[PDB]
Every structure is written in structure tokens, then in C-alpha cells.
Swiss-Prot record, chains A, B:
The entry's keywords: Acetylation, Activator, Biological rhythms, Chromosomal rearrangement, Coiled coil, Cytoplasm, DNA damage, DNA recombination, DNA repair, DNA-binding, Immunity, Innate immunity, Isopeptide bond, Methylation, mRNA processing, mRNA splicing, Nucleus, Phosphoprotein, Repeat, Repressor, RNA-binding, Transcription, Transcription regulation, Ubl conjugation
Subcellular location, principal: nucleus
Species name: Homo sapiens (Human)
Compartments, as annotated in UniProt: Nucleus speckle; Nucleus matrix; Cytoplasm
Residue list for modification Phosphothreonine: T88
Classification of source organism: Eukaryota, Metazoa, Chordata, Craniata, Vertebrata
RRM domain ranges (all copies): 17-89, 91-172
Section covered of the full-length record: 281 to 535 of 707
UniProt name for this protein: Splicing factor, proline- and glutamine-rich
């Protein structure tokens, strides 16, 4: 049954299997909360805050969590509509400034000293090349905190070149659920913005002139942003050239 | 069986179900290529280039494609190891400069005029707020090309405010397969960089001084980048203020 829903290789009960549940009834008990999810296999770690009406539950696999979220979100429980969402990932880190010779496996080996790793991936572009950025997800939050603190306050190197890894807690974007219409607040500004439907503006119209100015601002930002990035690249290249010179004399025992 | 592997809601045979297969034998036929994937349900669209030894196949669901990729990549077929990867997404678009009142459903409705939509999502941050960016994936490449061309050369508005959508072909990053170690070229530079293992540099050492300079360059880029973004925000705010003034007189039939 439910073990067919695991992805190839997938480990069980990971941080990505954790659901948030809100708007629970006042008399909710832990066993009643578990029973809500009994259909979706054996429960993992469970927490409830009865007074504030919310809890967390880890399910076996990502697919089971998605099924549970889809079937239970916005359904009634004793007079209130439950709110079932994927929980935030507070044991995940973004890592940047990776040498292109850092792999998934090396990234995992390096950060495994701080604690058990659930996920360690080097992000690659649509040409298969390292972007210099990656993600490390720890099984526990203290381990992710230790890794962020040690790498921020000191110099953590993954390769011979002294290229320090830059670590920040992951600020994950959501491109699967997105912004559903029923989750958009239908305030006064909402109804104002929806008065006119999607449309093309004609040259010379009211809208067209302002919109072309808006395009121009965005193009100016793109140009200025690339200037910043190119200056960074040139500064990196100058530093790398200087380090290489010194490294060759260092290896000759002259430094 | 294989219909349990569909995600909740998921449509079948989408662009995200398309696999690339390389290093096929010289005598490959289309029916032999289909037979390689016979275990994974009914095949969708299939293409082969016999002379260059590669083909594409769409499978029913994303989960089936991942199973097929995991089981067939780097396996022998008549003397050569097959290369099975997820195909590139050339009918997908990135859309930016979205008003925060654009939902998944409005984005889909707007771009559905160019052709059938497989996916339309507004990307939200870890606070559930619109990032101003989204993804639109068309069932066909001509439709995605039409949408990119019309929105680039003209002014496409989704709301009353004349905020133009900025459309570019999607440059998708990969955070699932990542950069596996066996896909890293083990050239001379590779072995040089792996000589020293992951480690912390001590203050006053060779490595530490250069690495702190590297951190400083990255901090300077962060600061300069935020300056560019804040200048963009202020310019947007000034334009929005001017448009609002004019819109109120426009609605009074004075403009």
C-alpha cells in the first residue's frame, strides 16, 4: 500500500513530511489528532498546542503528506474548518559560494559533522552546471543551528582553495501550492485591482505610457544588478589570481 | 497500480513527465525504445533520432518518470550504458512584476489565451506572500513562444493598475538531482581541489586571511545589490504615486 508512494531512495519521516494543522477544536486530544491521520500510515513525531488549536505531524513519505494535506485541508472538525499546510523548514540551510568541484556527496560529508543529514544537494542550472549554491537539511534544528553558527563565525572550507562557504537559514520559496485564489484576501484593494481584466494596452493610451515607464525601471534595475555581479566576478578573479601566486610559492616551502 | 503514483489533482503526460534518453544503440527502433519503458504504463509522445542515439518519451505521471529514470539511468543496452534524465522544459515561462493580487487562477486565466496551460503558479515566500514572480507551462512550445513574444513586444496587464508582466523563458534550477559526484569530471583541477578535506581555517593562517577577504567581497556585493533593489523600490513607489493621482482624475472624466 502506502510504501509505494515513497520516491526512489526517499528516507522516511523527513522534515519535508511535516504538516501543520490549525483551527483544531478546544477539546482536541493527542489521540484524536493522530486519529485524523490514521488513514495515512503510522504517525511520526506529533505535537499539539491545545490552547491555540494547532499541531504538527510527520508522515511516512512526501506523497502521503501531500495526500493528507489535499484530503484534510478545509474540512470540518466539530464546527471549524481545519487548516492543513506543509510546515515551515526551520532545520534547513542555504549554502553559497561553493566551488564547482563540490558535489552532493561532498556537501553532505562536510556538513555531516554537525549532525545527521536528511538532504544535501548542490543546485545546478538547466545546463547541469553548479550554481555555487546548495541546500542542507538536518534531521534536527540544533544541528542546523550549530552549522550556521560555526560557519558564520569562522571559516569553513570544502576544498583546497580557501573558498569559504556562506551559510544562511533556508528561505524556501513555494512553487507547488503557490497563491491560490481563495487564499487571497478580498479587501477593497483586491476588488479595485480586479475591475479590469487581463488585457493588452494600446500604444498612446493612459495605461501604456505608465507601463512602459515601469518596464524601463525594471530594465534599469537589471542593468545595475548585472554591474554589481560583474564587479564581484572581477574582484573574485583578482583574489583568486593572487592566491594562486602565493599557493605556488607556499608549495615550494617559500611561504 | 500505476495510477496511485499520480499526485493529488495531477494531469497526465505533462512536460514534467518527459524523459531524455541518450547513448541508444545504432539499430534502435521506435518500438524497441517504447519497450524499454513498457513497465511504466502506456507511453505518451515519443521521438527518436537513430543517428545520434537519443530520444524523448513522456510517461503518465511525474512519479512514474522518476521511477523510470532511477531504474534505467546508467544501465546497459547492447553494449552501452543508457543515459536517462529529465528533459529540459522549453515550453515553460518565468513571469515577473506580478501585482500581489494575482493568484494562480488569474495567472492561468490570463495566459490561457495563448494556448492550453499545464501549470500556472504564483511563487510565494515562506510567509505565504506573493514574491511577484510565477511560472506558466504551456502544453506546446508554439504557445509559450507566442506568449513570450506578445508580452515582450507589447504591454500585458493582469489588473487595473497598469503593471506590465515581464515574461522570459524559464531558466529552471535543479534542487532534486543536483550535482552527483559521479557526474563531476575528475580532471586535474578536480584532484587538486580535493587534496584538502572539509575543514575550518584557523585565524592567522594562510587560508584564513584570503577566505576573510572572500567573505568581505561577498558582503560588499550583498550591500551593493540591496542598494540597487531599494532604488528600484523607490522608483516604483514614485511611479505608483503619480499614476494614482492621474487615475483619480481619470475616473472623474478630467483625463
Amino acid at each position: 500500500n502506502l510504501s509505494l508512494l515513497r520516491r526512489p531512495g526517499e528516507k522516511t519521516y523527513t522534515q519535508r513530511c511535516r504538516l501543520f494543522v490549525g483551527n483544531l477544536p478546544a477539546d482536541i486530544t493527542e489521540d484524536e489528532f493522530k486519529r485524523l491521520f490514521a488513514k495515512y500510515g503510522e504517525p511520526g513525531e506529533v505535537f499539539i498546542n491545545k490552547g491555540k488549536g494547532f499541531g504538527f505531524i510527520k508522515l511516512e513519505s512526501r506523497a502521503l503528506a501531500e495526500i493528507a494535506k489535499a484530503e484534510l485541508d478545509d474540512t470540518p472538525m466539530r464546527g471549524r474548518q481545519l487548516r492543513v499546510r506543509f510546515a515551515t523548514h526551520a532545520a534547513a540551510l542555504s549554502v553559497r559560494n561553493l566551488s564547482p568541484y563540490v558535489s552532493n556527496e561532498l556537501l553532505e560529508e562536510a556538513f555531516s559533522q554537525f549532525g545527521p543529514i536528511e538532504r544535501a544537494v548542490v543546485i545546478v542550472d538547466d545546463r547541469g552546471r553548479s550554481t555555487g549554491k546548495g541546500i542542507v537539511e538536518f534531521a534536527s534544528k540544533p544541528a542546523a543551528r550549530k552549522a550556521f553558527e560555526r560557519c558564520s563565525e569562522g571559516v569553513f572550507l570544502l576544498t583546497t582553495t580557501p573558498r569559504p562557504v556562506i551559510v544562511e537559514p533556508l528561505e524556501q520559496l513555494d512553487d507547488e501550492e503557490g497563491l491560490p485564489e481563495k487564499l487571497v484576501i478580498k479587501n477593497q484593494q483586491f476588488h479595485k485591482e480586479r475591475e479590469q481584466p487581463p488585457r493588452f494596452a494600446q500604444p498612446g493610451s493612459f495605461e501604456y505610457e505608465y507601463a512602459m515607464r515601469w518596464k524601463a525601471l525594471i530594465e534599469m534595475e537589471k542593468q545595475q544588478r548585472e554591474q554589481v555581479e560583474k564587479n564581484m566576478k572581477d574582484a573574485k578573479d583578482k583574489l583568486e589570481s593572487e592566491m594562486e601566486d602565493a599557493y605556488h610559492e607556499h608549495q615550494a616551502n617559500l611561504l
